[model samples]
Target: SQLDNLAFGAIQLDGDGTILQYNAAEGDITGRNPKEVIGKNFFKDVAPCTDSPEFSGKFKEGVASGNLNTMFEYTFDYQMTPTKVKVHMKKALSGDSYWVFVKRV
Candidate 1:
């Protein structure tokens, strides 16, 4: 998709939180293959590291209101190997989903 035009990572997730599209940049950055992550529960499986309130909490809140155009920096350590990334979450008005973008800080 044209989303590959992005240099960073882009993940399109449905309202149910399932990944609809996982761009290649995301694969390169996370060491995960897009083929492997597509259709999976983004918060539960792929980035299970972000299942807490600090990150995932924001997702739930945004989805509830149907708007999420925010960005933040975070150190992820789902369980060490702590790494920092810039997180940008946005809503898709007509797509009935959300787009979570990421990049290494």
Candidate 2:
């Protein structure tokens, strides 16, 4: 129901990058299976394109400070062509949780 409110790709992840929820739009956009990605490390296993400091490092910092709203352009290279996307991260509705919002650019 939560993802129904969003038109773009949306995913929820735990503090350590373990995916908690994967929305339909996200699966359609990223061409990844929810069953495969759920419980996996988002930055490491699912999306190594974001494994660098610019992405995963900022995530760790945001979780630590509880102020992790960030946005930038990035490329997702997990099983598809180099797809450029506008990546956004924010504290989720629940404290201690986070959401990664994406849109193709």
Candidate 3:
């Protein structure tokens, strides 16, 4: 409910990229159920369309450097449709978690 109350899509991931939390808005935007995505890798398993250097590459860099709070634009083509989205990558202050916030562009 915490994530569903938000106006945008949000997903929290573990340091290793595993999905720790998936919200309703995220499911609405990506057409993916939380049940199907939880415990999976956000970039590789859930959304391989982002496996490119632009999206996943940036994420990995941010994680490794301990500085991921940033925003960018991206296109999702995993489901065979081009969906433009704005992405926000935020690393928790504790450095133990990562969150991806998304909105339709």
Candidate 4:
């Protein structure tokens, strides 16, 4: 089935920034399964990258101002390995959706 190969951390957020879904791929990326991440707040329980107002202040502004097109590159320690990840976001598709899609660089 396509869904088997199709895996991603589909972090869906409402207009209020509440996490609604965290697929298995997302859990695998964060080292936590969906069982723990689903229903939990994305900024609080899942990934804390979006929690920082100073770092993600621009993203927040975009979401609030309706110009949500944003692209930023950042490096983080992924399981003791420093990895660079690119984050892109746009105006809430169904709502205000934001996420960090990662790949090795």
Question: Taking the tens digit of each residue's C-alpha lDDT, what string does model 3 give over 1-105?
Answer: 377799899899887789998988888888898888999998888899878787778788888998878888998878746789999888976748999899999
Residue-level lDDT of model 2, residues 1-105, one tens digit each, is 577467789889999999998887788888898778889999988999899888999999989988889999999987887888998998886667899999999
**Cα-based RMSD of the predictions, in order?**
2.0, 1.4, 1.5, 3.4
Worst 10 residues of 4 by lDDT: 1-10
- Order the numbered candidates by lDDT, best leading: 2, 3, 1, 4
| Candidate 4 vs. true structure, TM-score | 0.64
Candidate 4 lDDT by residue in tens digits, 1-105: 532243443555544555666566655555666566556766554556556773356656766777766666666553434546565555655554664444434
Question: Pairs clashing in candidate 2?
Answer: none
Off by more than 4 A, model 1: 77-81
Which candidate do you rate higher for lDDT, 3 or 4? 3
Q: For model 1, what is the C-alpha lDDT against the true structure?
A: 0.83
Model 3 alpha-carbon miss at residue 12, Å: 0.4
TM-score (C-alpha) between model 2 and the true structure? 0.91
lDDT (Cα) of model 4? 0.56
Q: Pick the candidate with the highest lDDT.
A: 2
What lDDT does the true structure give each of the candidates? 0.83, 0.87, 0.86, 0.56
Per candidate, the number of residue pairs that clash is 0, 0, 0, 1
User: Which stretches of model 3 miss by more than 4 angstroms?
Assistant: none
Q: What lDDT would candidate 2 get against the real structure?
A: 0.87
